[PDB]
Chains A and B, each alone.
Chain A
Amino acid sequence: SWDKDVYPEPPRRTPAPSPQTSLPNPITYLTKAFDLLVDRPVTLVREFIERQHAKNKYYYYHREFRRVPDITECQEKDVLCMFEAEMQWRRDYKVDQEIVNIIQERLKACQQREGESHRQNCAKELEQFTQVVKAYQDRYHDLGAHYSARKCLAKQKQRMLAERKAAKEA
């Protein structure tokens, strides 16, 4: 139903029942009632619906965007190139936002899944979240409401210069 690599999920290890009591377990009987009363009729209705969907079958596609020159290759005040470069930067900006969302979803799933052990068993999820958020902060933070590829480029050049000097301190 979804990509198991984009949204990884560790294997499920469930104990086998090992009762130590003569009394009947209500959950066992209620589970059977649910499966008979709820699951099966709900399953029959879905099978009917899917049959209709196997008779009218058609497709939709994921739009593929050709890459175009970046704002770094545009001449000053050349709107025609700036426009296409700018639209591309906006598209990547929105995709980068959802990448950070994916990484945040992984972190929050891990925290719930691991329970009281989450502090130790969610280290790789927490480290990756730190790395992506750092990268996202460098790209896009502090640009303002009127952000643009031009402003994003200026922010990078300022960072590349500061890193270059700190390198030159060696």
Chain B
Amino acid sequence: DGPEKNYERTMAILQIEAEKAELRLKELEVRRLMRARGDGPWFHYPTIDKELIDHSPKATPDN
């Protein structure tokens, strides 16, 4: 292979590995904030579904 092909092939390799590296660090930071604050799709632990509540008038009036 010529030096240019190897040279520019290396730039292509470096670009991909640097884009993967930046995303790996961002993912760790995003996971740090999602887990600590609970305001994202991840670490979304379930709470009771309010569709289970019955709102029909009850036998007594205070409820």
Contacts of A87 in B (CB 8 A): 7
A83 at the binding interface (Cβ < 8 Å): yes
Count of A interface residues, CB-CB < 8 Å: 6
Measured CA separation A83–B17 after assembly (Å): 13
Asked if A80 contacts B11 (CB within 8 A), the reply is: yes
Contacts of A36 in B (CB 8 A): none
Measured CA separation A77–B14 after assembly (Å): 11
Range of interface residues on B (Cβ < 8 Å): under 10
Contacts of A79 in B (CB 8 A): 14-15, 17-18
Which A75-110 residues sit within 8 Å CB-CB of chain B? 77, 79-80, 83-84, 87
Which B1-52 residues sit within 8 Å CB-CB of chain A? 7, 10-11, 14-15, 17-18
Contacts between chains A and B (CB distance < 8 A), count? 14
Contacts of B14 in A (CB 8 A): 79-80, 83
The chain A residue sitting closest to B18, CB to CB, is: A79
Contacts of B17 in A (CB 8 A): 79
The chain B residue sitting closest to A82, CB to CB, is: B14
Contacts of A83 in B (CB 8 A): 10-11, 14
Measured CA separation A77–B18 after assembly (Å): 9
Distance (Å) between the CB of A148 and the closest chain B CB?
A: 15
B contact residues vs A (CB 8 Å cutoff): 7, 10-11, 14-15, 17-18
14 A-B contact pairs sorted by A residue (CB < 8 Å): A77-B18, A79-B14, A79-B15, A79-B17, A79-B18, A80-B11, A80-B14, A80-B15, A80-B18, A83-B10, A83-B11, A83-B14, A84-B11, A87-B7
* A-B contacts besides A80-B14, A80-B18, A83-B11, 5 pairs, CB < 8 Å: A79-B14, A83-B10, A83-B14, A84-B11, A87-B7
